[PDB]
């Protein structure tokens, strides 16, 4: 049995050294289509379009998570919460 | 020489929205810079859009699309309605 934290650190190392996509293609595509259902109707998508969309979402979420990790350690914590999320977004300038 | 600005037009708009409301010169300069900035943003976006669609003309359609891209929400909605009414009234002459 491993102590909690070591598996997480190994996961962090592996996912930082790797570059593959982390969100399942079909669920992300269905999410994109669901969001598109509101603006227009019967929209069609290029496969590269949802691929680039997923790339953007991956990068933005990774940057936000890094920012919130910095906020959490600044608050003398190692666990993030939506208080950290909202602080990071507010100072970035989206809220 | 002459240095043009939107002073007369901004004053006319302010008088038409408020019959009894004066304005200072510094606030007027802020208004002129604001109008120039919005003109720059909208026209630059429209020119970019025309370039990307392999089009060599800016018309009401790309102006409308640039307005919708820039202005948020009901501001964009009201601005689009105002622009469409103005274009309709102008072409109906």
């Amino acid at each position: 049995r491993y102590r909690p934290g070591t598996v997480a650190l190994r996961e962090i190392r592996r996912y930082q050294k790797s570059t593959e996509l982390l969100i399942r293609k079909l669920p992300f595509q269905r999410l994109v289509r669901e969001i598109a259902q509101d603006f227009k109707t019967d929209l069609r998508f290029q496969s590269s379009a949802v691929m680039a969309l997923q790339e953007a979402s991956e990068a933005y979420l990774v940057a936000l998570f890094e920012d919130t990790n910095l906020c959490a350690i600044h608050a003398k914590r190692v666990t993030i919460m939506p208080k950290d999320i909202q602080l990071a977004r507010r100072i970035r300038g989206e809220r | 020489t002459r240095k043009e600005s939107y002073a007369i037009y901004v004053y006319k708009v302010l008088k038409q929205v408020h019959p009894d409301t004066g304005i200072s010169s510094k606030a007027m300069s802020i208004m002129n810079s604001f109008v120039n900035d919005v003109f720059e943003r909208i026209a630059g976006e429209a020119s970019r859009l025309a370039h990307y669609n392999k089009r060599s003309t800016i018309t009401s359609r790309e102006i409308q699309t640039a307005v919708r891209l820039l202005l948020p929400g009901e501001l964009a909605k009201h601005a689009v309605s105002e622009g469409t009414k103005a274009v309709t009234k102008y072409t109906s002459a």
Binding site: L22, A36, R44 | -
Partner: protein, 84 residues
């Protein structure tokens, strides 16, 4: 021919958000991070999709393109490379 699809944004699953946090260098995850992440992710996509479909309706097309995705991203300051 295309039936509407509600209740799909739960497909951004907890293992996926955990993997994203692991890539971002996050050590420990609370309970509400998943709901928070899903919400902000939906907002990000919604804003992007609004810009992209505005481009598409301007182009008088019906297929949203990877080009238009990069178009909206560069509009947002989120410019993306390798896709045109």
């Amino acid at each position: 021919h295309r039936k509407v699809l509600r209740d799909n944004i739960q497909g951004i699953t907890k293992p996926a958000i955990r993997r994203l946090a692991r890539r971002g260098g996050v050590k420990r995850i609370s309970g509400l991070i998943y709901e928070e992440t899903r919400g902000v992710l939906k907002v990000f996509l919604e804003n992007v999709i609004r810009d992209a479909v505005t481009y598409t309706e301007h182009a008088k097309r019906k297929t949203v393109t990877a080009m238009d995705v990069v178009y909206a991203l560069k509009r947002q300051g989120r410019t993306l490379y390798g896709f045109g």
